[PDB]
Amino acid sequence: SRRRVVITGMGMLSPLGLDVPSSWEGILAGRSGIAPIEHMDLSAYSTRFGGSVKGFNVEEYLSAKEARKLDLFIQYGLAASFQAVRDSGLEVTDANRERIGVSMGSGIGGLTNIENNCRSLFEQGPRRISPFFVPGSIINMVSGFLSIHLGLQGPNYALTTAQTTGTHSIGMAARNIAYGEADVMVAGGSEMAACGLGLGGFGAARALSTRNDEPTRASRPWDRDRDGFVLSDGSGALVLEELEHARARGARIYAELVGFGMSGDAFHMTAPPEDGAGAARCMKNALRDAGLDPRQVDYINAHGTSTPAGDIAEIAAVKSVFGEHAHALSMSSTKSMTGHLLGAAGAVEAIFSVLALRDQVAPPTINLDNPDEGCDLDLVAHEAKPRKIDVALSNSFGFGGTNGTLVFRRFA
Amino acid sequence: SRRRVVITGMGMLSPLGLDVPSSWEGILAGRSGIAPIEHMDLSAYSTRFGGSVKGFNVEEYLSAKEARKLDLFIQYGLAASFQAVRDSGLEVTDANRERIGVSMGSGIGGLTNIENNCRSLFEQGPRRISPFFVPGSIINMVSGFLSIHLGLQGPNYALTTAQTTGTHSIGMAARNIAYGEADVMVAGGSEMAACGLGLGGFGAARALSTRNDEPTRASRPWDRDRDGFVLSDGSGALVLEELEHARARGARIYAELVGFGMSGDAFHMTAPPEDGAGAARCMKNALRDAGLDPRQVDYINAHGTSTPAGDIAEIAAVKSVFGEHAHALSMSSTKSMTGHLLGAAGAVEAIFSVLALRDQVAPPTINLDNPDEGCDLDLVAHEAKPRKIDVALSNSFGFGGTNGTLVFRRFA
Numbered sequence: 060s061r062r063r064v065v066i067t068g069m070g071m072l073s074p075l076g077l078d079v080p081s082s083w084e085g086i087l088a089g090r091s092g093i094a095p096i097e098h099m100d101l102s103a104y105s106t107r108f109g110g111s112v113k114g115f116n117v118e119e120y121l122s123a124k125e126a127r128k129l130d131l132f133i134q135y136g137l138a139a140s141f142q143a144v145r146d147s148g149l150e151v152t153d154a155n156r157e158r159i160g161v162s163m164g165s166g167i168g169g170l171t172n173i174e175n176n177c178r179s180l181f182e183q184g185p186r187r188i189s190p191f192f193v194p195g196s197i198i199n200m201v202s203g204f205l206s207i208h209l210g211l212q213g214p215n216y217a218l219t220t221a222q223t224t225g226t227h228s229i230g231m232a233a234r235n236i237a238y239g240e241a242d243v244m245v246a247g248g249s250e251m252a253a254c255g256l257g258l259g260g261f262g263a264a265r266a267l268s269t270r271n272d273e274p275t276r277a278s279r280p281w282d283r284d285r286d287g288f289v290l291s292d293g294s295g296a297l298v299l300e301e302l303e304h305a306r307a308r309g310a311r312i313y314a315e316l317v318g319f320g321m322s323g324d325a326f327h328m329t330a331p332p333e334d335g336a337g338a339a340r341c342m343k344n345a346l347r348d349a350g351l352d353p354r355q356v357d358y359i360n361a362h363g364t365s366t367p368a369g370d371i372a373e374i375a376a377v378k379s380v381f382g383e384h385a386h387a388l389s390m391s392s393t394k395s396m397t398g399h400l401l402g403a404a405g406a407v408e409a410i411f412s413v414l415a416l417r418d419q420v421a422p423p424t425i426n427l428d429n430p431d432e433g434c435d436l437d438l439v440a441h442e443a444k445p446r447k448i449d450v451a452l453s454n455s456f457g458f459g460g461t462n463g464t465l466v467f468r469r470f471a
Numbered sequence: 472s473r474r475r476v477v478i479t480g481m482g483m484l485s486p487l488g489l490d491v492p493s494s495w496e497g498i499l500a501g502r503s504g505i506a507p508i509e510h511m512d513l514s515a516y517s518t519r520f521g522g523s524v525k526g527f528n529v530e531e532y533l534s535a536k537e538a539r540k541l542d543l544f545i546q547y548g549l550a551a552s553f554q555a556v557r558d559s560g561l562e563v564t565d566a567n568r569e570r571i572g573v574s575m576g577s578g579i580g581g582l583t584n585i586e587n588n589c590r591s592l593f594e595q596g597p598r599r600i601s602p603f604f605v606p607g608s609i610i611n612m613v614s615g616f617l618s619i620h621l622g623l624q625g626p627n628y629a630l631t632t633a634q635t636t637g638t639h640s641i642g643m644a645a646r647n648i649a650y651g652e653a654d655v656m657v658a659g660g661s662e663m664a665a666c667g668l669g670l671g672g673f674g675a676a677r678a679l680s681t682r683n684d685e686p687t688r689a690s691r692p693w694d695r696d697r698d699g700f701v702l703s704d705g706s707g708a709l710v711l712e713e714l715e716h717a718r719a720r721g722a723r724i725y726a727e728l729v730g731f732g733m734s735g736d737a738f739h740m741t742a743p744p745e746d747g748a749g750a751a752r753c754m755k756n757a758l759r760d761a762g763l764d765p766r767q768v769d770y771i772n773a774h775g776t777s778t779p780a781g782d783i784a785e786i787a788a789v790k791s792v793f794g795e796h797a798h799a800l801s802m803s804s805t806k807s808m809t810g811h812l813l814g815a816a817g818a819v820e821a822i823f824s825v826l827a828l829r830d831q832v833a834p835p836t837i838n839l840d841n842p843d844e845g846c847d848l849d850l851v852a853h854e855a856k857p858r859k860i861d862v863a864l865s866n867s868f869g870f871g872g873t874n875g876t877l878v879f880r881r882f883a
């Protein structure tokens with residue numbers, strides 16, 4: 060058999076706020092976090108906007124000296140991670156520290172640090188490269204620094220699965236607990252790819268919306284006028300915990316993680332298959348994992364990136380998996396408001412799926428003014444929808460055809 | 472309930488060879504793969520040598536057209552993965568493709584690619600960034616491109632845990648199989664960090680040997696004259712397979728993977744604790760996981776990076792875990808010959824641990840002229856040692872205090 064895994068703490072940096080309740084307030088109000096990118100010359104770039112984290116104070120978390128050693132993506136992961144542990148009320152002791160682990164991931168990692176150290180390398184030569192360049196830039200340093208700050212001695216690792224990172228991190232963290240490797244995990248993802256190489260890299264593949272005149276309308280999942288995704292920054296962290304461990308200390312339980320699906324499309328390097336076969340296999344894997352029939356699913360937080368091929372594949376996938384129940388469930392893209400946090404997308408959207416269960420409300424897909432051909436599901440267009448939600452899915456799909464599905468159930 | 476996991480295929484690029492057999496002959500003969508770097512001008516760098524893959528022909532594996540789009544770390548990852556899958560004799564069919572996944576990791580991923588596109592960005596502008604920059608550079612695309620080429624629709628992900636990546640990738644892929652999420656996984660790692668940012672970054676931290684005038688003697692694990700690790704490039708991939716699946720199809724079985732340990736040190740961002748506490752916890756987790764008497768351990772493939780602090784910590788850990796049996800086992804560092812393949816270190820070294828079991832020989836630590844204070848175990852100085860080996864252990868440690876142990880034994 061298998062142990063049960065519940066969510067006892069959550070933490071977040073998003074384009075909508077510097078914590079969960081501020082972010083969620085934005086989500087349910089249909090507020091956009093998208094705006095022209097500041098303190099950065101994007102004149103030569105075809106995209107000049109995205110979801111930036113606004114007003115973040117790293118010194119709430121770290122000394123200025125420690126923050127100077129770490130890429131923004133690491134600072135954001137630590138912020139969410141420290142919020143999530145504090146939210147959980149968990150007391151780390153000598154008796155439990157070996158049973159508490161970390162899996163915080165990134166799609167892209169320390170691009171901003173790499174770019175500034177490149178500046179120094181090209182202009183002055185290697186002797187201007189920071190000594191903290193390597194440990195301050197690598198993706199496992201959110202897990203590493205968190206474990207060192209808090210004395211966590213359980214499983215210590217990082218996933219990097221492109222836009223699927225957050226979903227995979229949480230899912231495999233839940234496996235570690237379910238199969239007795241740990242009693243607590245801090246899991247999720249962080250991303251800060253709003254550098255030249257980030258905007259430039261996605262810009263060169265024409266993956267980005269170029270709607271510079273109306274940044275708040277750029278992200279329009281399933282809308283016939285969508286033209287690619289919106290690049291966003293931030294982090295999500297969840298405290299995952301074995302149920303008996305949570306009950307014994309009187310933890311506040313947000314929801315239970317009942318199901319985790321992984322699948323590979325094995326299709327294309329960047330494009331999803333049009334019939335959504337991969338997303339369909341992954342969701343079916345996750346529902347089997349939960350012992351749930353597709354009819355029991357009430358809410359899906361879609362990947363919903365606002366790319367032509369991505370949005371339509373997810374419609375096909377849901378119709379395929381859910382048949383006669385496909386219109387009954389509500390499916391929304393919170394990327395309509397946050398944009399695409401890449402590796403952290405799965406983390407913040409897991410938290411929104413948990414909060415949809417707590418508050419019995421499907422978040423809107425804003426900007427869905429003209430649903431595209433065959434986009435006829437309940438996509439919660441424009442405004443939040445109060446409804447019955449016992450079971451919520453969060454889907455992620457990524458470059459390399461890598462799929463992730465988490466199934467959350469109400470806990471009472 | 473937990474299934475057993477065996478190795479049925481292996482593949483490799485190392486500084487000693489373009490496959491496993493050729494690499495392994497170099498190991499047993501005590502050959503160095505370390506040489507002045509030729510692919511760039513390192514006159515302004517304090518370290519000008521490393522373990523390059525020599526004469527790699529990507530067109531043994533991939534079309535020139537696809538190869539041009541991929542960082543060397545991806546090319547190296549795919550070459551090892553293709554070798555391993557071919558070496559397994561496994562046939563991918565519609566009957567099994569959903570039960571076959573991949574977890575190939577990297578410490579740093581496409582740093583050469585990111586630097587070249589950085590140069591283009593700074594000298595030309597954003598319009599000269601390759602459209603292939605992202606899918607061609609990010610860590611998860613070894614797993615991605617392998618799944619696309621072979622049609623693997625099982626779990627598809629990637630770990631990044633710095634110098635522990637290869638051991639974690641293998642260990643967690645074994646967990647996937649053990650607990651029924653897959654019947655087969657291709658798992659290991661690849662690294663190509665020998666660019667300006669790589670040698671410069673490790674250079675800035677003064678982590679690297681500066682023995683430019685004698686590169687073959689640079690890597691000298693536990694030698695009193697060691698002065699840092701030697702940076703090396705390459706790939707290791709293994710085909711992990713549920714025992715009964717392997718038995719059913721008549722697979723040749725190299726060895727059984729009986730044990731996996733992870734622990735975080737929670738000590739320091741980059742320095743290991745002098746007493747080896749994190750390595751000790753990790754090895755004890757792994758031996759308990761394998762249901763072993765510690766006295767069953769015959770051979771350890773050490774992390775053995777040739778740093779002052781890392782090398783003695785490992786002696787401390789092995790003495791603490793094995794007590795008087797620490798004087799009966801053999802421990803060596805093949806990094807004496809290969810140098811430190813970083814995220815691929817744990818992958819090549821897992822394969823060397825398996826071949827130590829097949830061939831009943833402890834690979835040497837070359838350059839161990841003057842063992843340092845306290846380094847008085849059988850470290851197999853200078854020359855391969857034929858000997859009884861039923862149980863072999865492979866250790867990795869990385870930045871972030873991240874530890875990994877794999878336990879293999881002979882299978883009949």
Ligand SMILES: CNCc1cccc(Cl)c1
Pocket residue numbers: 231234235238239240643646647648650651652
């Ligand atoms: C099905 N996978 C279960 C698993 C994954 C990772 C670690 C452990 Cl213990 C178990």
